[PDB]
């Protein structure tokens, strides 16, 4: 009866079902957990918001077209405006979180295409000016739930001031490595003939027990079309990709007034 | 060494000291506590924000003058815009809280005056029109940290629309009972010759285990000058009264999008 | 509904409500649907980004035809009233495309689902009363 | 031949019944019967369905 294709995930007041899964990945074989006393750093009693924040948040959907080059998000950036998770994140200097990432993309038995879904620790990307190095604005690095897109062309700006964004070049994974090697990162593939969803469970990953969520993204989420969307009756068809992410084992330290980041 | 006059209270990252206290009141002899499984109602796993929210918040100070008739606040209304307590309150349908109320008023050995400090369950007050009954706007009932003032005169409005506020008449406690009987409510007195602070620890009080904090104030806080401020060198002198309140054993149910109440 | 008709013989209700959805498109139709319950006191959700902050389930359409969303018992009062009443308001149930429904060619591009409601085992009613759903001329 | 039974609790507790009539039809209401088996209406299926398992395997 039980199947690698059929899964239920419940966190807080939220449940996901899938009937065409392909198992689930636990990044580096490690389930998320709370911070042990023997690895702790800040000494204030932490906030552990539990079900208020540790629940599935669904981002705005994106459209997969035959011409799409791919999509990226950063975490916890993508969830910074999500209910009580966002409030706990911005009221505290420090936060840590694992995640359940659920990527959703259904089609038909007559569609074809394959998405690589990669969870990348410290997903540092190239800037878009050759007048400077490491020259990216906070606003362009932290787009929130809209994330960003890859391009198949690199056109760095004439003026340094116009190039303060990522050069998200697909085949170099936006960071000077070949995209074919992205499989060293925790991943699944959504191959439309096989599966309609990817599930990645991510532990907290950092060189520290806990860090400034508003300064630092622990994970990149990359969705690359490895094989282009094709549908014989309409080559210009679009199918949605929906990203749903639950924080897990969230813990916050250093309560004060709320952080309100710059928007320009 | 230990004295009824000298007290330290620590909640979360916040500490109060007083060197001229008069013991402390525990309303109805009951310390606040979390909601037991055998008295529970909503079935979702509650949020218990602990140190993020269960900490001392200091309101704007008010000025005690020889002509002051008194001050009122409602709880949890007075704390609705206070850090993570306010966020937890408005992100949830349901909340319960106890409080430590610390009222602060120092003067000199040459000043005189006495404040009655009363914690009143279900502090329902009279409206200011005789064209209607029970005719108070949400905005006037819920002033937040600024609270309101008592008057020694009742001047109900000509037009029903102009009288949608409390008739906070001091000697009738704004509710048709004699102020001299307010001592049946949990209270202390700040008598300037004796003490410079009042401390009241309040359990959650309601006919329910948990309720809608945005709809319903569980407690009124009333400060009445029982004996007027007097200072021989300057009868027009003013001394501050500062109100500092810590939520305690806070518990929230029914997470959703944030409540944003009407402001007009 | 059968539940609604029974509730209209009672004044008070308590407990969790079960909403079960049956997708009746073709086998070739795929999709993900968000089903949400938002407890009351905030802006009623009209967008997926507000709905997903409440209690919700992401339903993947597939071989298992049906998905159950719960409105868990989340109330100030121990009972709600079996009338329209601000004090005992229950909140908001909404539904959005999580991705979209996708079909191949030669397949209907519009289709239906059926929504069912039932009470959970935590559910009870009290204070018997006459219903407003039957009457006669005199 | 008095029957002593538990009352339904109120705000804050036995009661006594004697039957006066030779016909059971004369008796007061039947005692509370909390019997129920919703599954005969909610799950009248031949083959057991385990909630955690797929409904259709």
């Amino acid at each position: 009866g039980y199947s690698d294709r059929v899964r239920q995930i419940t966190l807080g007041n939220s449940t996901i079902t899938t009937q065409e899964a392909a198992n689930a990945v636990v990044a580096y074989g490690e389930w998320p957990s709370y911070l042990d006393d023997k690895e702790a750093n800040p000494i204030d009693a932490p906030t552990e918001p539990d079900v208020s924040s540790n629940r599935f948040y669904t981002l705005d959907s994106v459209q997969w077209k035959s011409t799409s080059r791919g999509w990226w998000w950063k975490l916890p950036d993508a969830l910074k405006d999500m209910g009580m998770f966002g409030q706990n994140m911005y009221y505290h200097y420090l936060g840590r979180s694992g995640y359940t990432v659920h990527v959703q993309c259904n089609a038909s038995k007559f569609h074809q295409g394959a998405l690589g879904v990669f969870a990348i620790p410290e997903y540092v990307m190239a800037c878009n000016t050759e007048a400077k190095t490491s020259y990216v604005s906070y606003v362009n690095a932290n787009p929130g739930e809209k994330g960003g897109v890859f391009d198949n062309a690199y056109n760095p700006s004439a003026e340094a001031s116009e190039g303060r964004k990522f050069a998200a070049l697909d085949y170099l994974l936006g960071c000077g490595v070949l995209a074919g090697n992205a499989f060293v990162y925790p991943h699944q593939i959504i191959n439309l003939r096989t599966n309609n969803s990817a599930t990645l469970v991510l532990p907290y990953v950092n060189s520290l027990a806990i860090d400034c969520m508003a300064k630092h993204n622990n994970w990149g989420l990359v969705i690359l079309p490895l094989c282009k969307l094709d549908y014989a009756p309409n080559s210009s068809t679009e199918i949605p990709i929906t990203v749903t992410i639950a924080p897990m084992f969230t813990e916050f330290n250093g309560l004060r007034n709320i952080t309100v980041p710059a928007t320009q | 060494g230990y004295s009824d006059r000298v007290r330290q209270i620590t909640l979360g990252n916040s500490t109060i000291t007083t060197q001229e206290a008069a013991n402390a009141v525990v309303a109805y002899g009951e310390w606040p506590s979390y909601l037991d499984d055998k008295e529970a109602n909503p079935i979702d796993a509650p949020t218990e924000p602990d140190v993020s929210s269960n900490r001392f918040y200091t309101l704007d100070s008010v000025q005690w003058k020889s002509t002051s008739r008194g001050w009122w606040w409602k709880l949890p209304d007075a704390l609705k815009d206070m850090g993570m307590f306010g966020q937890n309150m408005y992100y949830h349908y349901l909340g319960r809280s106890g409080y430590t109320v610390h009222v602060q008023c120092n003067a000199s050995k040459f000043h005189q005056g006495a404040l009655g400090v009363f914690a009143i369950p279900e502090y329902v007050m009279a409206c200011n029109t005789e064209a209607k009954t029970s005719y108070v706007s949400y905005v006037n009932a819920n002033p937040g940290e600024k609270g309101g003032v008592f008057d020694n005169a009742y001047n109900p409005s000509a037009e029903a629309s102009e009288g949608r506020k409390f008739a906070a008449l001091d000697y009738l406690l704004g509710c048709g009972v004699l102020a001299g009987n307010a001592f049946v409510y949990p209270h202390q007195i700040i008598n300037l010759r004796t003490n410079n602070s009042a401390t009241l620890v309040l359990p959650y009080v309601n006919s329910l285990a948990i309720d809608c904090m945005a709809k319903h104030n569980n407690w009124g806080l009333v400060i009445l000058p029982l004996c007027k401020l007097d200072y021989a060198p300057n009868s027009s002198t003013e001394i501050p009264i500062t109100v500092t309140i810590a939520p305690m054993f806070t518990e929230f149910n029914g997470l959703r999008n944030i409540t944003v109440p009407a402001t007009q | 509904t059968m539940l609604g008709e029974i509730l209209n013989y009672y004044t008070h209700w308590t407990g969790s409500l079960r909403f079960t959805f049956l997708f009746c498109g073709s086998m070739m139709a795929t999709g993900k649907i968000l089903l949400s319950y938002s407890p009351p006191g905030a802006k009623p959700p009209t967008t997926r980004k507000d709905a997903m902050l409440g209690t919700h389930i992401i339903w993947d359409l597939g071989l298992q035809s049906s998905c159950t969303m719960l409105a868990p018992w989340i109330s100030n009062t121990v009972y709600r009233r079996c009338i329209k009443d601000d004090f005992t308001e229950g909140g908001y149930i909404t539904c959005f495309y999580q991705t979209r429904i996708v079909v191949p060619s030669g397949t209907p591009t519009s289709m239906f689902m059926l929504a069912f409601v039932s009470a959970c085992p935590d559910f009870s009613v009290r204070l018997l009363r006459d219903t407003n759903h039957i009457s006669q001329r005199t | 031949g008095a029957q002593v039974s538990s009352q339904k609790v109120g705000a804050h507790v036995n009661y006594t019944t004697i039957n006066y009539y030779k016909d059971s039809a004369s008796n007061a209401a039947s005692k509370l019967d909390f019997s129920q088996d919703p599954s005969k209406f909610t799950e009248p299926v031949k083959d057991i369905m385990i909630k955690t398992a797929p409904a259709l395997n």
Partner: peptide, 27 residues
Amino acid sequence: PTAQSTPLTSGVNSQEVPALTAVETGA
């Protein structure tokens, strides 16, 4: 005899999927 109590439960990440069913069965 009382209506059902609610047990303490946390989250899941599982091949157990009680949220999905098939009401075609008559259940």
